[PDB]
Amino acid sequence: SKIIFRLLLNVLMSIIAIISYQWYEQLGIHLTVAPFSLLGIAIAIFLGFRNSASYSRFVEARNLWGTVLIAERTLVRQLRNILPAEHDAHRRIVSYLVAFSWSLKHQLRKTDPTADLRRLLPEERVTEILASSMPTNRILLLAGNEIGQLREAGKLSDITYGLMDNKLDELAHVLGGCERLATTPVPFAYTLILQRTVYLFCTLLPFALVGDLHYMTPFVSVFISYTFLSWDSLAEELEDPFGTAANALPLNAMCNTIERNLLDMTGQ
Amino acid sequence: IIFRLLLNVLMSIIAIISYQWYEQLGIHLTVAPFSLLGIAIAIFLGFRNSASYSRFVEARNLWGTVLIAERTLVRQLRNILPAEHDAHRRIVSYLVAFSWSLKHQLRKTDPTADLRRLLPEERVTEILASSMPTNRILLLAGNEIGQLREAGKLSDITYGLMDNKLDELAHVLGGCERLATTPVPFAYTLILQRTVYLFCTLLPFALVGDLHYMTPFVSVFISYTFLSWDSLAEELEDPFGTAANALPLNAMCNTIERNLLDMTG
Amino acid sequence: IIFRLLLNVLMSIIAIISYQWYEQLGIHLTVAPFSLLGIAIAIFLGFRNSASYSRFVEARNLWGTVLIAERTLVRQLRNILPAEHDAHRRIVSYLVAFSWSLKHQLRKTDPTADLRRLLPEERVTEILASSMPTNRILLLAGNEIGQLREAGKLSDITYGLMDNKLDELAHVLGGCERLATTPVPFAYTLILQRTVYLFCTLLPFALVGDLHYMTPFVSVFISYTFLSWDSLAEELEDPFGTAANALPLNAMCNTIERNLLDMTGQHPLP
Amino acid sequence: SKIIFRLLLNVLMSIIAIISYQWYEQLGIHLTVAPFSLLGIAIAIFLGFRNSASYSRFVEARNLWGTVLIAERTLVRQLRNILPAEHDAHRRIVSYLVAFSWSLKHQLRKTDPTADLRRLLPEERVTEILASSMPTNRILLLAGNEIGQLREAGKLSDITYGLMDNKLDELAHVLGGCERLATTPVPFAYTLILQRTVYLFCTLLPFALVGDLHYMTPFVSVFISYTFLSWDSLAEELEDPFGTAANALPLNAMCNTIERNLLDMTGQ
Amino acid sequence: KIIFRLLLNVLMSIIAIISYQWYEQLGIHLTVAPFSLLGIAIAIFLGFRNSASYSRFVEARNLWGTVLIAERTLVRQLRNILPAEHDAHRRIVSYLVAFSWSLKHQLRKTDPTADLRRLLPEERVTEILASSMPTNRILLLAGNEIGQLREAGKLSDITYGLMDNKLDELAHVLGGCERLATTPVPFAYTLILQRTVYLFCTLLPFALVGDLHYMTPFVSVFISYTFLSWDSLAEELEDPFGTAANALPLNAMCNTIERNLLDMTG
Ligand SMILES: [Zn+2]
Ligand SMILES: [Zn+2]
Ligand SMILES: [Zn+2]
Ligand SMILES: [Zn+2]
Ligand SMILES: [Zn+2]
Ligand SMILES: [Zn+2]
Ligand SMILES: [Zn+2]
Ligand SMILES: [Zn+2]
Ligand SMILES: [Zn+2]
């Protein structure tokens, strides 16, 4: 990664620090570790408070997608527990439930849900989902019609309707939550203040080290840079929880984890 | 944007051109007390920086709940009362006015323009004549829900479902007004911001013996770190304000209007 | 409060004048042990300040819920029973009296005058004849909701909607009583106040070795930083007091009163 | 208490450090303070993260006993608004709610609740309570029958039963929480490491302080030891809030405030 | 203290003594200032890691505590609404106990076959085990048992709705217990911190032999053992559903759950 390919830049700066210092006493400039000890601790504190604030954003993103699996489990569970014979209406409500997660992933992955929506639904309902400015929310609205048309039919009482209605709210905070994380990210004034302070601290660190470390400088400076640049790279992976990176959320595999449950909850 | 930190560069350079009075007026300023003082300050600045971010998160979570609540509320009307679009455009218009009137209550601005756009003048005067306009709007939306209670159009259960989502909006109002009135006492932030700069200006006075001519480079680089982690924390304690890293409340109310209006049909 | 640092400059002034003799018993004082000691204090002073702030937030969070619960409860009355405006003015007074007695319960004041202002004396005398007066108000307001259920005006469902709004008010009482009756760091705060005062006074004795006569200039600045972070750290753990304390419940207790009265129509123009 | 001994033992090691200071400079060992700042700060960092772990557990312990206070209030209040005349059932559910608080306090103090059960309940029901595994859970089950025997007879609707039922679950989440705070203690595999890292640092610090401060080490070493030894000893009572510590929860007084409240809602 | 690598920290300390004197050449020197700053920088990051992992341990305990509480209240509501239908009692309890055990086997990745055959008929064990997420098949079967009491007219939908809210408390745990064991913090950080902690502990004695020649092995381990310990706790708290009996005793909680529901009948 860019961390590792720029961890090399301080090694030459350390040897540059070694090969310099010969005109230092003429100019009259000296660089010790005491100001960088103060500065380094101040940076490591701010990097730590920035990392734990980022970790919660990773946890909050993780909890919202975990609730989807919980809500749809119980919703299909309640449909097979209150209306066990309406297995014709089971697979319709399920199909909307499957479309929401995929449309959620494609809405958070900024891709095209057209291909995945036609797989589960007749084309009539796919464009109806695509006709609104928020297709996922149209699915929640569409899921209500399959639940709502059963209310006036006398199959579910108004309480049994409200109890299943209370399971779309758990689903509704997820869409409203995942949409909220990607539009209000951690204020960029944060990562830029740390990467501007970490990189500039890492480059000027060997200039403070060879006055006390002499030739052992490149070994120590890189080990301190590696610690900061790795601790900083953690903040860069927590900011993309819905992306395609090598170490992100496997949302394609998580939509798969949700689909195999509901389909085994009805038929196969 | 900066606190003219260049003045510490002059304060660092002043120590250099004064350093000629080093042993004559008998001054020693070492790094250990300023390291102790500086580490203690960066420790105290770290706990405040995360604390302001938390106030920022609570405001965004409340505004996200607003988008979710009105999302679900307009949805519940479309599943139980599929034909009652005469009451939709009234309940929706009240819900949209709630968001705009809330933002103007937190910005201490005038909500007159946005209310006349969505509601009739006769009821706009009804809203503006009260000491709590948002709760009066939420109260007005309840009348449109209450007039739907009637006797048999919505069951006794079904009213409670919409009542259980108007209170979700009310816990937002009680919080957002609480965040805009419950901050750190404006005498404890003041003692903290003035302590950082006093460490910031006297830091080069102690760094000359160590960093002779390299003093302004480190003094500014430590100034930049301390003055930034403190000045950004001053942007997050008022997420309803006009700061850079503030909540762009204009665009969230705009996103809610485009949501409900796309739900009308 | 302020002269503690003037005592600290004097400790430096004494430290300056009591160090030319600093050889009686062979003794030297360095800054490194006080850096470790000071950094450990800044770690512990930082963790103690965060605990006080949290109880301050819960005091605002619980008192913020007071505004919401009484709003939602009174608003619920104007959407289901808009014509029974006679029962509005009774529940409101209880909700207004609940907040006032809630403020009066935690400040250890006499709620008689504000209860005589808002309630008839028969309910004032019975409430003041109880030790837990606030819990009686929600119970008295609960009968107002129960009598509307027993008469046929509120269904078994709709009663439960308003009962869940008196419970939000009931969870407020038990929490505000919990923060004000068990401020747990009881008597153990002086782990820092006795250490900071002792650290700040012995600091110039360790600083006058490096900073000779310039010691008070730094000595007050490090003492000012620790003792100000300390006086702030114990101002927030009592979010119901006077002086600089940032909770002014009277303006919040009045605002809930003026809100429900403005939600019921108490400013008519003839 | 057991930190004044370590402080008295820490003063004695400093006097040994002075009278041995002349012995170990020939032995061929030298001791500076610089590792002890890193080690002490590393310990001072760990004492801060552990104190936050104990303090959070104490607040949760206090909140559960506040929740018992609130839930039984609402349950007694909900009973006085739906069945206000059923005072034959008032003193029965109140006694169950009161016995619940006491039996829980005896369950966390690991004593025998028989004595307070004969005071509040009929003796035959004391035999029934003691014949179960969890005595507290048997009490709330008894409170449910008094609500349950009122529903099937026609006095409580299916809805109004749930309104009071939703307040016994609030009491049940307390029992499992109070059970979790006790049955699942904070991970104490480090408390012994904190006994071993702090005292060995506190005792060996004056051996490193006698290098710079000659006679002033016992004055300084205690000020560093007392500050270190205080922050750890405070963490030892806050992680055990159901015991008989000086900061512990005075559970005796909480049951009294709960009983005197519920008794004040029943005409006394 | 099972760290055999803490003894490995001692060996370079004597090497540091025999080398400090043998290789001052070419200017390379190791002083204490960079490793003190670096050590504090690590101790800051190790503290933020333990509390983040510690919360993962706490969240794991609450999920199993909610399982204990949820099954309690569900049984409480049934003996207060249907005290006479004890023929149906012996069925639901077995599912909740089978759910409790099957959840522990799902997080421990062990075999629940015997645990289900003790409680359920072979035909229903074949139905549960011949499917994905057997715990959810148990809760779905437990839901079927509640639906038949509404369809029987024995439970109103209101009292049914009172009980339905308790299958979600168990389902939010299952979906929650699935979350803690499947997506922890990325491993690419576990090793870079294990490579940063162990490499810092081994390179410390080369930096300690300044004026600390003979006292080096005593301090290096006391700092390394202290560092190697505070990191090792975060490695047990990050996997609270793992093999470590000192992490979570699911056997002691699943049995404690069994002892309660079985104690309402004997
Ligand atoms: Zn089916
Ligand atoms: Zn419409
Ligand atoms: Zn509310
Ligand atoms: Zn009215
Ligand atoms: Zn409650
Ligand atoms: Zn009574
Ligand atoms: Zn529960
Ligand atoms: Zn039975
Ligand atoms: Zn749920």
Describe the fold and architecture:
The structure is a homopentamer. The first copy, chain A, is mostly helical and 268 residues long. The first copy, chain A, has one domain (1-268). Chain A has helices at residues 2-19, 24-27, 34-82, 87-108, 114-120, 123-130, 135-148, 158-183, 191-209, 217-238, 251-266. In chain A, helix 3 runs antiparallel to helix 8 (158-183), helix 4 (87-108) packs antiparallel against helix 11 and helix 9 packs antiparallel against helix 10. The two termini of chain A are 43 Å apart. At the A-B interface, helix 3, helix 7, helix 8 and helix 9 of A face helix 2, helix 7, helix 8, helix 9 and helix 10 of B. One zinc ion (ZN) is lined by residues 71, 74, 170 of chain D.
Concise account of the structure shown:
By secondary structure, chain A is an all-alpha fold. Helix content of chain A is 76%, strand content 0%.
- First-residue to last-residue Cα separation of chain A: 43 Å
Apparent shape of chain A: rod-shaped
Radius of gyration of chain A: 27 Å
Task: Specify the structural class of chain A.
Answer: mainly alpha
Helix content of chain A: over 70%
Total of helices of chain A: 11
- Largest contact between protein chains? A-B, 56 and 58 residues
The biggest beta sheet of chain A is recorded as:
none
Strand portion of chain A, in percent? under 5%
Instruction: List the ions, cofactors and other small molecules found in this model.
Output: zinc ion
| Quaternary status | homopentamer
H/E element sequence of chain A: HHHHHHHHHHH
Number of strands of chain A: 0
Please, how many domains of chain A? 1
